[PDB]
């Protein structure tokens, strides 16, 4: 139950800001102090300065964000994945990680997680 369309909107805008590298929109979609678990087995960063200081550090990498499968959203939380098509200084590498989500009931984004690894990455020519 629970229209997953609302939880999916956060994922859209969440990435729409990624694709456009508009952190301002990410922090916007991120509660005043939402929590983000990343990297894995690492330490999250709660707060707008943290969520941004974090998501911002991720934007420092000029890549392309474009989902590929179907976003997942259940209960007040949610989970989705995408691919990062960045470029190197002579080669082109892409990645295929996934992200988690933690809302509070149509009240913007509260917490968030991120899953991936050197196996969900890519290395082609």
Closest separation in Å from C-beta 40 to a copy of itself: 4
Work out whether 105 is an interface residue with a copy of itself (CB under 8 A). Answer: no
**List 20, 49, 75, 123, residue binding a copy of itself (CB under 8 A):** 75
User: Per-residue DSSP letters for 3-47?
Assistant: -HHHHHHHHHHHHHHHHTT-HHHHHHHEEEEEEEE-STTS----S
Q: How far apart, in whole angstroms, are the C-alpha atoms of residue 65 and residue 77?
A: 22
Report the partner that residue 119 touches, choosing among ligand NTH, a copy of itself, none (CB closer than 5 to 8 A by kind): a copy of itself
Using CB under 6 A as the binding rule, the residues of this chain from 18 to 57 that contact ligand NTH are: 38-39
Which residue is associated with the tokens 């392309």?
A: 64
Annotated binding site: 99
Q: Cβ neighbours of residue 48 under 8 Å, at least 6 residues apart? A: 27, 30, 32, 33
**List 79, 84, 109, 110, residue binding ligand NTH (CB under 6 A):** 84
Work out whether 117 is an interface residue with a copy of itself (CB under 8 A). Answer: yes
């Amino acid at each position: 139950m629970n229209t997953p369309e609302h939880m999916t909107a956060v994922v859209q805008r969440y990435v729409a800001a990624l694709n456009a590298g508009d952190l301002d929109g990410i922090v916007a979609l991120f509660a005043d102090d939402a929590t983000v678990e990343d990297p894995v087995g690492s330490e999250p960063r709660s707060g707008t300065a943290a969520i941004r200081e974090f998501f911002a550090n991720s934007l420092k990498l000029p890549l392309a964000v474009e989902l590929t499968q179907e976003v997942r959203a259940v209960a007040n939380e949610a989970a989705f994945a995408f691919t990062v098509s960045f470029e190197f200084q002579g080669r082109k590498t892409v990645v295929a990680p996934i992200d988690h989500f933690r809302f509070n009931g149509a009240g913007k984004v509260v917490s968030m997680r991120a899953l991936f690894g050197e196996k969900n990455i890519h290395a082609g020519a």
